[PDB]
Amino acid sequence: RGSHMTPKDDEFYQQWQLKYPKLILREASSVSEELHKEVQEAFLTLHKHGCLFRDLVRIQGKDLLTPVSRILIGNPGCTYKYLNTRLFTVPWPVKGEAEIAAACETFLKLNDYLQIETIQALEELAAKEKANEDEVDIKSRAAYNVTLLNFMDPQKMPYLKEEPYFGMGKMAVSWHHDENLVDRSAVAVYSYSCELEGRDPDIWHVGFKISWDIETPGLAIPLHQGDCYFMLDDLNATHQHCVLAGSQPRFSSTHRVAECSTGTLDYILQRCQLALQNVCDDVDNDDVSLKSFEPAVLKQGEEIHNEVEFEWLRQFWFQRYRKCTDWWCQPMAQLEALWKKMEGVTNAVLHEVKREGLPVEQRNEILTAILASLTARQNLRREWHARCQSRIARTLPADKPECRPYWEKDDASMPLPFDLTDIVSELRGQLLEA
Numbered sequence: 001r002g003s004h005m006t007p008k009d010d011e012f013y014q015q016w017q018l019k020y021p022k023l024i025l026r027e028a029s030s031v032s033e034e035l036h037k038e039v040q041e042a043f044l045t046l047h048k049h050g051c052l053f054r055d056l057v058r059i060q061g062k063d064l065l066t067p068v069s070r071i072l073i074g075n076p077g078c079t080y081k082y083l084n085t086r087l088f089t090v091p092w093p094v095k096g097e098a099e100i101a102a103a104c105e106t107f108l109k110l111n112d113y114l115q116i117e118t119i120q121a122l123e124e125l126a127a128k129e130k131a132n133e134d135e136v137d138i139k140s141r142a143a144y145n146v147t148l149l150n151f152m153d154p155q156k157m158p159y160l161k162e163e164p165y166f167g168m169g170k171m172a173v174s175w176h177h178d179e180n181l182v183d184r185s186a187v188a189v190y191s192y193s194c195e196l197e198g199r200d201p202d203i204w205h206v207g208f209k210i211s212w213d214i215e216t217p218g219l220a221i222p223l224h225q226g227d228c229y230f231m232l233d234d235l236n237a238t239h240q241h242c243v244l245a246g247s248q249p250r251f252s253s254t255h256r257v258a259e260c261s262t263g264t265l266d267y268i269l270q271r272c273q274l275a276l277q278n279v280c281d282d283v284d285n286d287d288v289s290l291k292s293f294e295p296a297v298l299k300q301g302e303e304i305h306n307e308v309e310f311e312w313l314r315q316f317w318f319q320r321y322r323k324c325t326d327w328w329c330q331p332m333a334q335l336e337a338l339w340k341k342m343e344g345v346t347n348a349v350l351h352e353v354k355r356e357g358l359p360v361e362q363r364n365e366i367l368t369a370i371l372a373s374l375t376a377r378q379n380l381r382r383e384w385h386a387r388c389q390s391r392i393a394r395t396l397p398a399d400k401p402e403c404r405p406y407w408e409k410d411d412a413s414m415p416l417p418f419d420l421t422d423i424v425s426e427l428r429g430q431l432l433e434a
């Protein structure tokens, strides 16, 4: 059953209506030639300045480079995490170089145009579903807060897998569901390419299959120069999708409702600010002393610590994003500061855990409360320091993955060592002690 359809087959349009009716396709006419123009140089503007980057992802246990170059434009302070990798937004000119400032702006226009299109589609989708058997839900599933711009030149990048279930040709992006979206939220894409049985291998497509199902014939939508398609509602969860490479270079602007409830700057700042509620905070120095050693406060402390380190600092310093935009340099330098003080708190606790006159029963309580996070912290320091210095990250330019923050045991500037194995095996020792 290696079968697919395209508009060349008449079966295709009914297989469309009653398998994938949550796929929408508005041809380039639904977009002014003035909007096409402004957007298509916003792509080049961004591509000239060299903003886009292949991503060093990690799927299952293996590190891979993404065939596609990618940049993320969106609400300032917002982030989109996929494949264990967090992208940070190059911000666009909403509430609050010369070229870049206007490029990010264009897409915000693009983004607002699409958002309108997505609402009527979704109003028309609830309407078909009233003639047979809330409109703020619908507005919220269309409030795109970010767009992931995608680029590929099929000629400068001729290392492509073939589509295995249906024979759709080579793939610029393999079968997948989109991660980290608001539930039932829509995804809208502007596709921008340059210039007999099966699908046409010179032209770009988006593929679609039912999950778990390589029998029902896939779909293969042709995408030409300013075409748009929309994934409505549960589509991205009921269906897998892919991209099928054409012959010419191609941009795509893919607009999402990223689920950044724990993936925004204002959120991770506030966790730090809560963590540091246990710090006697009169003056910023390294006489870190803590108000409480209540075991729930310490646990919460050490957990926020891990989150800023691994979810924010290590994720950021695995990337660069320092060409078009610099928005994150202050915030990042400020989370390093908060992170560093916390390494002090952890120090404070280790001292407390070992103080002469603390009845072991209370020291076993402090331990048991903090051991998990301090052991998780070690294991991720390894996974990072490995994934960082996999020799696949030396090949990348001087423009390649830092392993940061990293200090070395003969570094009086850091209170505890970077390798906690002795400290943690030493904690576990006490707890088992009779």
Ligand SMILES: CC(C)(C)c1ccc(Cc2ccncc2C(=O)NNC(=O)/C=C/C(=O)O)cc1
Residues within 6 Å of the ligand: 057, 059, 064, 065, 066, 067, 082, 083, 150, 173, 174, 175, 176, 177, 178, 179, 189, 191, 206, 242, 243, 252, 254
């Ligand atoms: C092969 C490997 C490198 C593991 C890989 C596989 C799939 C993806 C795609 C992906 C996964 C999770 N969340 C979002 C995506 C993603 O980038 N979706 N964007 C698109 O499908 C864009 C389609 C289009 O260009 O219109 C990215 C990377």
Ligand code: NI
Residues within 6 Å of the ligand: 176, 177, 178, 241
């Ligand atoms: Ni996708």
